[PDB]
Design an enzyme around this catalytic site. Structure first.
Site, short mmCIF file in Angstrom:
data_model
loop_
_atom_site.label_atom_id
_atom_site.label_comp_id
_atom_site.label_asym_id
_atom_site.label_seq_id
_atom_site.Cartn_x
_atom_site.Cartn_y
_atom_site.Cartn_z
N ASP A 265 0.85 -1.20 0.00
CA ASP A 265 0.00 0.00 0.00
C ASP A 265 0.88 1.25 0.00
OD1 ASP A 265 -2.38 1.51 0.35
OD2 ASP A 265 -2.29 1.34 2.53
N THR B 290 -7.03 3.48 -1.73
CA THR B 290 -6.63 2.12 -1.50
C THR B 290 -7.68 1.10 -1.94
OG1 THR B 290 -5.22 2.81 0.26
CG2 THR B 290 -6.00 0.53 0.26
N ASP C 157 2.47 2.98 3.06
CA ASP C 157 1.41 3.97 3.17
C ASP C 157 1.26 4.53 4.59
OD1 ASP C 157 -1.76 4.17 3.93
OD2 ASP C 157 -1.48 4.86 1.87
N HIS D 210 1.73 8.61 5.15
CA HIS D 210 0.76 9.61 5.57
C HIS D 210 1.32 10.50 6.71
CE1 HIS D 210 -2.91 8.62 3.36
NE2 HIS D 210 -2.62 7.35 3.53
N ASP E 255 -22.02 10.20 -25.98
CA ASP E 255 -22.15 9.44 -24.76
C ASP E 255 -22.99 10.15 -23.71
OD1 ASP E 255 -21.81 7.28 -22.94
OD2 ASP E 255 -19.86 7.98 -22.22
C1 LIG Z 1 -5.78 -2.38 6.75
N1 LIG Z 1 -6.10 -3.46 5.79
C2 LIG Z 1 -6.85 -3.18 4.65
O1 LIG Z 1 -7.24 -2.02 4.44
C3 LIG Z 1 -7.15 -4.34 3.72
C4 LIG Z 1 -7.39 -3.74 2.32
N2 LIG Z 1 -7.51 -4.76 1.27
C5 LIG Z 1 -6.70 -5.91 1.17
C6 LIG Z 1 -7.08 -6.60 0.03
C7 LIG Z 1 -6.53 -7.90 -0.43
N3 LIG Z 1 -5.12 -7.98 -0.12
C8 LIG Z 1 -4.38 -7.16 -1.10
C9 LIG Z 1 -4.61 -7.62 -2.53
C10 LIG Z 1 -5.57 -7.02 -3.39
C11 LIG Z 1 -5.71 -7.47 -4.70
C12 LIG Z 1 -4.90 -8.50 -5.11
BR1 LIG Z 1 -5.04 -9.16 -6.91
C13 LIG Z 1 -3.97 -9.13 -4.29
C14 LIG Z 1 -3.82 -8.66 -2.98
C15 LIG Z 1 -8.15 -5.88 -0.61
C16 LIG Z 1 -8.92 -6.07 -1.78
C17 LIG Z 1 -9.90 -5.13 -2.09
C18 LIG Z 1 -10.13 -3.97 -1.29
C19 LIG Z 1 -9.39 -3.75 -0.15
C20 LIG Z 1 -8.40 -4.73 0.18
CA LIG Z 2 -23.22 5.71 -23.86
ZN LIG Z 3 -3.20 5.82 2.34
#
Ligand SMILES: CNC(=O)CCn1cc(CNCc2ccc(Br)cc2)c2ccccc21
Ligand SMILES: [Ca+2]
Ligand SMILES: [Zn+2]
Ligand SMILES: *[C@@H]1O[C@H](CO)[C@@H](O[C@@H]2O[C@H](CO)[C@@H](O[C@@H]3O[C@H](CO[C@H]4O[C@H](CO)[C@@H](O)[C@H](O[C@H]5O[C@H](CO)[C@@H](O)[C@H](O)[C@@H]5O[C@H]5O[C@H](CO)[C@@H](O)[C@H](O)[C@@H]5O)[C@@H]4O)[C@@H](O)[C@H](O[C@H]4O[C@H](CO)[C@@H](O)[C@H](O)[C@@H]4O[C@H]4O[C@H](CO)[C@@H](O)[C@H](O)[C@@H]4O)[C@@H]3O)[C@H](O)[C@H]2NC(C)=O)[C@H](O)[C@H]1NC(C)=O
Ligand code: NA
Ligand code: NA
Length: 805
Positions: free
Chosen positions: A121, A159, A261, A265, A683
């Protein structure tokens, strides 16, 4: 309710989730407050830490330990990751010279190379170079595998929208996670980072990779980790799953890090406090690679190291407050920060008008650090409109800034020094991609690409059929050694008509006039040849676009340009012309200022008319092929054909005329000629897809002439600019735009100035991929080149971003 009195004995990090009220032992149980009473004791062991030491080597197994250094640990699959290094004289993976992985070197019983996605992140793209000295494991992955200099996230560069885009291949407007915070007016429900609503499956659209895999019989690790589970335990859990028997073992896994991340921040992207979180992530990568090397999997697994978005310097003092603009600030709800979204505070407020809100927020302060848009007017490249969770009013915030409703929101919530969320072309928002393993290429740099393309590749790496998504499958084939996806070009649906001269001048009653009644066997046959397509190879360089829907249209040839003329929409779908480096710009002659000429190839009933423009006091017209770039005074008459005319608001004509008169020649000079394809886009429902006739909301008054919502141009030349665009032997170079067709230039705060001070700035903001134009038009470009089709798919996904190095 959870019956926490069950046990995690033999169930630690179980893959199948058990349903309430049964207690859980999976990697997400903590997030649901649902773990069995003994989950910490059994599943989160920490005794003696994460590393073997000399004195532990050959130890009698103690099941209390976080990881093991006993002789049985390899068979058990639970050694500390540095076990073979400390106890058996092996090297760390990072210390081994890299050697090309030509074939998967997998242990017996492995049906395919596993995929491990290592997601980070807030990992800004420039960390790969700027942090390289403190990230040796990551630098080995990058240098030895396949890497891009950066990867472009989706907007908003937050995120949850990005991680879910990575998982699904979809834009946020399609997958539904359009922000970290959302209100859905149909559900009457609010999604937040904190709390339980976010676990409800109704928010999450599309089909993420773990589901795609499961549905097609490929087992997946559980991708989500409760935040309190330390990274070392995440890595150990992955390695333990990789030791499962063949029939139980997943083929795809994910690790996630909340860093860098979290610290970014607090400290800003390059705060001196950032070095340690980069070191720590590198150390985690090294644990994983050492662990894979122990399992003899380090030349078997494909590893993706990938980020969600970058991080920019943003501090509390750089906040714009809506209370300095709006008289009625208590009547709105703002979703604030690095993007703004505005809706009515009360749906019972009949005094709510988005028009007065936009106007109050438009160019009101000299240095104003955000710009308001109705969502349909946002740059089409953001693909950020077609979802009921996206508020109609959007504020695009300048990098380094925030927007907030009132000052008290900012001190009754400086702490922070970094944030993200801005326009996804902003350099500080870009993130990282490295692929390492048998299926990726060796020591290979690939151009930047968008994160929406990765789902298809991850599917390719696992032998899965991707669910329908917004990637362009095949466009990332150049990342891969094997498992490429070899698409076929779509079939043309509508074949063109090729009309000859079929109508006499007097059959037309269009209310048009032209001073062209000025009168040779030499030149007469020559002009007939131009009308039959004798110059077409010069002006249609990559074949005619294919029309991928059912419609009636005509190919029209001319000396200087070729077009596909829609008899349904009364205007070209595309107009194609080439401008050499040597081309000269000329004026529209005085006697031709208001010239519009009937086209004797096209019936009066399928033509526009001038009277409609005369009577529509809001609407004027422009031309797709520019009269300014005519090859000769004689050829210039073709440019005034009624079949080259399109409806244009006077305010937009300022933009279009400057593009045609000044910028096209500039690009031809710089690029050694350019080929231009221009046309309208409709569109009206802002879904990013070509409108049908019955979706058109605006017409030139009294007529059936539809008004475009946008005008596009695709500008192509030779990548090797020592070759002219019309004599290019190798790869191409493209830039494109989709300009909003607006009745004002309120978007451009400097529009009272000469077009040289604002028009190109507007165009850069509305930069586009050829693929974006394909969706919006139902046309398929670059049908006839010398280039491999996957190379052309990569070209069609290119975005010219206009950011510095
Ligand atoms: C404090 N923890 C958080 O905020 C968890 C946030 N979070 C973690 C994942 C899943 N892991 C990361 C990931 C994502 C896609 C792939 Br392809 C491979 C690995 C995830 C998926 C969607 C939305 C939020 C998500
Ligand atoms: Ca359209
Ligand atoms: Zn952030
Ligand atoms: C990016 O890639 C994606 C994926 O390929 C592209 O999106 C697809 O575009 C299609 C056209 O817009 C769309 O097709 C429609 O599907 C309808 C059924 O949809 C449901 O089932 C699918 C399959 O499982 C599912 O994925 C859908 O998921 C959406 O909706 C749920 C909520 O239920 C969300 O959780 C989810 O996130 C997603 O929302 C997104 O899409 C919807 C539209 O489906 C938007 O409204 C959202 O804002 C959001 O963007 C659904 O669960 C189907 O009913 C449609 O058929 C209508 O139109 C056809 C024309 O061919 C016609 O034959 C029918 O008559 C029918 O019309 C009838 O309904 C009308 C509306 O009520 C009514 O007016 C008429 O009178 C008729 O009664 C249509 O085929 C497809 O669903 C999405 N898929 C996804 C995942 O988004 C996207 O276009 C690409 N983008 C670009 C720029 O290229
Ligand atoms: Na007019
Ligand atoms: Na303006």
């Amino acid at each position: 309710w959870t019956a926490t009195s069950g046990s995690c004995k033999g169930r630690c990090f179980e893959l199948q989730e058990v349903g309430p009220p049964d207690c859980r032992c999976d990697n997400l149980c903590k997030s649901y407050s649902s773990c069995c009473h003994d989950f910490d004791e059994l599943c989160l062991k920490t005794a003696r830490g994460w590393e073997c030491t000399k004195d532990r080597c050959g130890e009698v197994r103690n099941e209390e330990n976080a990881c093991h250094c006993s002789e049985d640990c390899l068979s058990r699959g639970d050694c500390c990751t540095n076990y073979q290094v400390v106890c058996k004289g092996e090297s760390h993976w990072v210390d081994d010279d890299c050697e090309e992985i030509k074939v998967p070197e997998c242990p017996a019983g492995f049906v395919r190379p596993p995929l491990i996605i290592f997601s980070v992140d807030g990992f800004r793209a420039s960390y790969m170079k700027k942090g390289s000295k403190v990230m040796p494991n990551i630098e080995k992955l990058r240098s030895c595998g396949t890497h891009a200099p950066y990867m472009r996230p989706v907007y908003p560069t937050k995120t949850f929208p990005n991680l879910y885009t990575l998982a699904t291949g979809l834009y946020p407007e399609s997958h539904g996670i359009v922000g970290n915070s959302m209100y859905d007016p149909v559900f009457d429900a609010s999604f937040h980072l904190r709390g339980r609503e976010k676990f409800n499956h109704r928010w999450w659209g599309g089909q993420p990779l773990w589901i795609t895999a499961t549905k097609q019989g490929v087992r997946a690790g559980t991708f989500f980790w409760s935040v309190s589970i330390p990274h070392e335990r995440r890595i150990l859990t992955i390695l333990q799953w990789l030791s499962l028997p063949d029939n139980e073992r997943p083929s795809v896994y994910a690790f996630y890090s909340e860093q860098p991340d979290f610290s970014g921040h607090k400290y800003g992207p390059f705060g001196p406090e950032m070095t340690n979180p980069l070191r720590e992530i590198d150390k985690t990568v090294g644990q994983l690679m050492d662990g894979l090397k122990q399992l003899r999997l380090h030349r078997c697994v494909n590893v993706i190291f990938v980020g969600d978005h970058g991080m920019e310097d943003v501090t509390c003092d750089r906040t714009e407050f809506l209370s300095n603009y709006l008289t009625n600030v208590d009547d709105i709800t703002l979703v604030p920060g690095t993007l703004g979204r505005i809706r009515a505070k009360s749906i019972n407020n009949s005094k709510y008008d988005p028009k007065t809100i936009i106007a109050a927020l438009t160019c009101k302060k000299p240095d104003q650090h955000f710009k308001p848009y109705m969502k349909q007017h946002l740059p089409k490249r953001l693909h950020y409109a077609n979802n009921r969770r996206i508020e109609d009013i959007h504020l695009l915030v300048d990098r380094r800034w925030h927007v907030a409703r009132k000052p008290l929101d900012v001190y009754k919530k400086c702490f922070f020094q970094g944030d993200h969320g801005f326009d996804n072309k902003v350099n500080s928002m870009q993130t990282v991609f490295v692929g390492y393993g048998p299926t990726f290429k060796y020591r290979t740099k690939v151009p930047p690409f968008e994160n929406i393309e990765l789902y298809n590749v991850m599917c390719d790496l696992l032998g899965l059929k991707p669910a329908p998504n917004n990637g362009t499958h095949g466009s990332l084939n150049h990342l891969l050694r094997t498992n490429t996806f070899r698409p076929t070009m779509p079939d043309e649906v509508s074949r063109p008509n090729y009309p000859g001269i079929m109508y006499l001048q007097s059959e037309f009653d269009l209310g048009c006039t032209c001073d062209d009644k000025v009168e040779n066997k030499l030149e007469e046959l020559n002009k007939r040849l131009h009308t039959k397509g004798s110059t077409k190879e010069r002006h249609l360089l990559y074949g005619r676009p294919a029309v991928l829907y059912r419609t009636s249209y005509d190919i029209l040839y001319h000396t200087d340009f070729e077009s596909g003329y829609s008899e349904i929409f009364l205007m070209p779908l595309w107009t194609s012309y080439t401008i050499s480096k040597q081309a000269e710009v000329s004026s529209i002659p005085e006697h031709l200022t208001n010239c519009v000429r009937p086209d004797v190839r096209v019936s009066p009933g399928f033509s526009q008319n001038c009277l409609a423009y005369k009577n529509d006091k809001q609407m004027s017209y422009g031309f797709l092929f520019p009269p300014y770039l005519s090859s000769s005074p004689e050829a210039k008459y073709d440019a005034f054909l009624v079949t080259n005319m399109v409806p244009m608001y006077p305010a937009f004509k300022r933009v279009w005329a400057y593009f045609q008169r000044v910028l096209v020649k500039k690009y031809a000079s710089e690029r050694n000629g350019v080929n231009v394809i221009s046309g309208p886009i409709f569109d009206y429902n802002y879904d990013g897809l070509r409108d049908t006739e019955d979706e058109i909301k605006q017409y030139v008054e009294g007529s059936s002439i539809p008004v475009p919502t946008h005008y596009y141009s695709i500008i192509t030349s030779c990548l090797d600019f020592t070759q002219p665009a019309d004599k290019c032997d190798g790869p191409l170079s493209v830039s494109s735009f989709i300009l909003p067709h607006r009745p004002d230039n309120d978007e451009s705060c400097n529009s009272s100035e000469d077009e040289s001070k604002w028009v190109e700035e507007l165009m850069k903001m509305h930069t586009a991929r050829v693929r974006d134009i394909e969706h919006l038009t139902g046309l398929d470009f670059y049908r006839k080149t010398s280039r491999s089709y996957s190379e052309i798919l990569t070209l069609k996904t290119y975005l010219h971003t206009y950011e510095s190095e």
